[PDB]
Design a protein around this ligand. Structure first.
Ligand SMILES: *[C@@H]1O[C@H](CO[C@H]2O[C@@H](C)[C@@H](O)[C@@H](O)[C@@H]2O)[C@@H](O[C@@H]2O[C@H](CO)[C@@H](O)[C@H](O)[C@H]2NC(C)=O)[C@H](O)[C@H]1NC(C)=O
Ligand SMILES: *[C@@H]1O[C@H](CO[C@H]2O[C@@H](C)[C@@H](O)[C@@H](O)[C@@H]2O)[C@@H](O[C@@H]2O[C@H](CO)[C@@H](O)[C@H](O)[C@H]2NC(C)=O)[C@H](O)[C@H]1NC(C)=O
Ligand SMILES: C[N+](C)(C)CCCCCCCCCC[N+](C)(C)C
Ligand SMILES: *[C@@H]1O[C@H](CO)[C@@H](O)[C@H](O)[C@H]1NC(C)=O
Ligand SMILES: *[C@@H]1O[C@H](CO)[C@@H](O)[C@H](O)[C@H]1NC(C)=O
Ligand SMILES: *[C@@H]1O[C@H](CO)[C@@H](O)[C@H](O)[C@H]1NC(C)=O
Ligand SMILES: *[C@@H]1O[C@H](CO)[C@@H](O)[C@H](O)[C@H]1NC(C)=O
Ligand SMILES: [Cl-]
Ligand SMILES: [Cl-]
Ligand SMILES: [Cl-]
Length: 523
């Protein structure tokens, strides 16, 4: 029986056998008061002491959210749906400890993504026991409120101030600072890492003064705040809050009475109406996301980044080869996960209005012109690259450029290996989200039918990530590997991650990102 005494009381963990060794797991530690009743839409309130022993022996509830019901029975989509009961009572965290108890281990804190509308830390591919066993680091992950329950915003109104889900994450970071020493962790060696909206979350913690003292450095996989889906303008935030109030019959003159009306509605009523607060949407639309609240975010994040107002530390940023392909089967005509999705030129143009609804005709023709300088799968591949470059790759590169211009070491990766167990079709390639299982070390478990080369790749990736967390330098020193060079604003070197051979290259998607970052904002 391994019991740890935290600042709020004792917690009961459990022992797991991993690779002939042992890992101690504490699943479902509460880190905030359940945000129920009057506490809905408010910032997380801090927890009070319990006099007995909390059993942290199973994953806790996942936060309320809508489910991906596009492909029932299909593992490719269902593997991302929550695997615990949905509940407003969801502010819990998990911690994996190596055995025996480490003296002063570096801590990795995972922040899941999902467009700020879905996600949970209990997913199979977020299992931190492998990292704890192999690299003897401590892995922490938390659930944070998503959707309107986590990001509904009436700016300046403390009953719905916005960024509540970001304050959830932040309170979990504070929990680590206060308690991780009792688990054998080093509160001064804390690395945040996250993917998609989690990576954008990580990037905003770099911008938020309240988070600066709560971590050491940061890893951003397939996401950043400057992505076009990652931040909602305060006009849109107000317009979407008033729309959900209208859709639920909560339209009141007093803005505070609107919120209180929303606190009496059942969570499913909120969730059902979340999709309709915008006129038109895209498969990447974030209805309720981060806002400039004057609290977590003191100013528009583009200004803070441009003017060097962020935590000065090392960062690790990267993207996958085909970030955009996943979203094409969620609206683009002629696309299907069950055939090769050979589309015509006309279907490509119809594809553009799905992902760029409010853009002018000249703007969409400029996208078309730029991506058609060439094969029957030309247009299919072009649309995937349009969606992936615009929503993920080019913003990530721009974030890395602007961050590194203020003197800090930055490292950029280009992940381009497609999992041998990938359930989606071959034309989708190296999809959004499918580097996560390599980072968490699933292919190190050889009983799960990954290839030998995938075990080697995951082992190398795991070592690089752990070395970055512990030493701020993501090298694999022992096995005659390729040295990972610093990303500088001029050379813009990056490392490719795959099974055959790592390579150092420069200026990823240089032509494409000049279009998206410099020209396309003008249309
Ligand atoms: C600000 O919100 C309004 C209201 O949104 C309404 O329209 C749907 C999205 C639906 O969910 C409904 O319940 C909701 O109340 C938006 O107004 C709409 O805009 C579209 C296109 O401009 C029109 O087709 C609608 O007729 C119009 N509705 C009204 C009542 O005027 C408005 O677009 C939005 N602002 C922005 C910038 O998107
Ligand atoms: C690849 O499949 C898409 C999707 O087709 C859907 O509907 C059925 C026809 C089914 O066979 C299955 O493929 C999928 O659930 C094809 O597009 C569809 O094609 C038909 C014409 O045959 C149209 O009437 C549909 O509206 C259209 N749907 C969409 C969303 O585009 C596509 O033609 C196919 N490509 C191939 C076979 O090369
Ligand atoms: C957005 N909608 C719901 C319309 C479609 C989402 C389709 C997602 C398919 C998985 C893509 C990778 C996801 C990785 N995670 C879940 C971590 C983001
Ligand atoms: C926690 O688990 C232990 C396991 O032996 C059990 O004895 C105890 O009653 C549990 N606490 C509860 C259920 O509150
Ligand atoms: C853990 O390491 C830090 C340096 O990062 C040090 O300041 C601290 O005293 C250490 N704590 C221990 C050894 O308990
Ligand atoms: C809105 O309601 C709050 C809560 O009672 C109140 O303090 C405030 O004065 C009201 N605003 C008005 C009446 O304009
Ligand atoms: C280095 O190579 C050895 C075998 O040569 C392997 O067992 C080990 O896991 C590798 N380590 C990393 C970090 O790749
Ligand atoms: Cl490529
Ligand atoms: Cl093999
Ligand atoms: Cl190598």
């Amino acid at each position: 029986d391994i019991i740890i005494a935290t600042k709020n009381g004792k917690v009961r963990g459990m022992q797991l056998t991993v690779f002939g060794g042992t890992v101690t797991a504490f699943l479902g530690i509460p880190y905030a008061q359940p945000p129920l009743g009057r506490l809905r839409f408010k910032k997380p309130q801090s927890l009070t002491k319990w006099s007995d022993i909390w059993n942290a022996t199973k994953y806790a509830n996942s936060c309320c959210q809508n489910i991906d019901q596009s492909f029932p029975g299909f593992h490719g989509s269902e593997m991302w749906n929550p695997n615990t009961d949905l509940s407003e009572d969801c502010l819990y965290l998990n911690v994996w400890i190596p055995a025996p108890k480490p003296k002063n281990a570096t801590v990795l804190i995972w922040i899941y993504g999902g467009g700020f509308q879905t996600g949970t830390s209990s997913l199979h591919v977020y299992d931190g026991k492998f990292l704890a066993r192999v690299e003897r680091v401590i892995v922490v992950s938390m659930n944070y409120r998503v959707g309107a329950l986590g990001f509904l915003a009436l700016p300046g109104n403390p009953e719905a101030p916005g960024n509540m889900g970001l304050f959830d994450q932040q309170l979990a970071l504070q929990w680590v600072q206060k308690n991780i020493a009792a688990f054998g962790g080093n509160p001064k060696s804390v690395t945040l890492f996250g993917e998609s909206a989690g990576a954008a979350s990580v990037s905003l913690h770099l911008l938020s003064p309240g988070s600066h003292s709560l971590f050491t450095r940061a890893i951003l996989q397939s996401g950043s705040f400057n992505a076009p889906w990652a931040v909602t303008s305060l006009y849109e935030a107000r317009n979407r809050t008033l729309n959900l109030a209208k859709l639920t019959g909560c339209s009141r003159e007093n803005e505070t009475e609107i919120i209180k009306c929303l606190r009496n509605k059942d969570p499913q009523e909120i969730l059902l109406n979340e999709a309709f607060v915008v006129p038109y949407g895209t498969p990447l639309s974030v209805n309720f996301g981060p806002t400039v609240d004057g609290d977590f975010l003191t100013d528009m994040p583009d200004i803070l980044l441009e003017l060097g107002q962020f935590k000065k530390t090392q960062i690790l940023v990267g993207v996958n080869k085909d970030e955009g392909t996943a979203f094409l089967v969620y609206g683009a005509p002629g696309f299907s996960k069950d055939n090769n999705s050979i589309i015509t030129r006309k279907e490509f143009q119809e594809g553009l209005k799905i992902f760029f609804p409010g853009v002018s005709e000249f703007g969409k023709e400029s996208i078309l012109f730029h991506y058609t300088d060439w094969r029957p799968e030309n247009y299919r591949e072009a649309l995937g690259d349009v969606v992936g470059d615009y929503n993920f790759i080019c913003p990530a590169l721009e974030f890395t450029k602007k961050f590194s211009e203020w003197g800090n070491n930055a490292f950029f990766y280009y992940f381009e290996h497609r999992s041998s167990k990938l359930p989606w079709p071959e034309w989708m390639g190296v999809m959004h989200g499918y580097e996560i299982e390599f980072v968490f070390g699933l292919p190190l478990e050889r009983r799960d039918q990954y290839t030998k080369a995938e075990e080697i790749l995951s082992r190398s990736i795991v070592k690089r990530w752990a070395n970055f967390a512990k030493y701020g330098n993501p090298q694999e020193t022992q096995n005659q590997s390729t040295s990972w060079p610093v990303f500088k604003s001029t050379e813009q070197k990056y490392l490719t991650l795959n099974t055959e051979s790592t390579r150092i290259m420069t200026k990823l998607r240089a032509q494409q990102c000049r279009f998206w970052t410099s020209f396309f904002p003008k249309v």
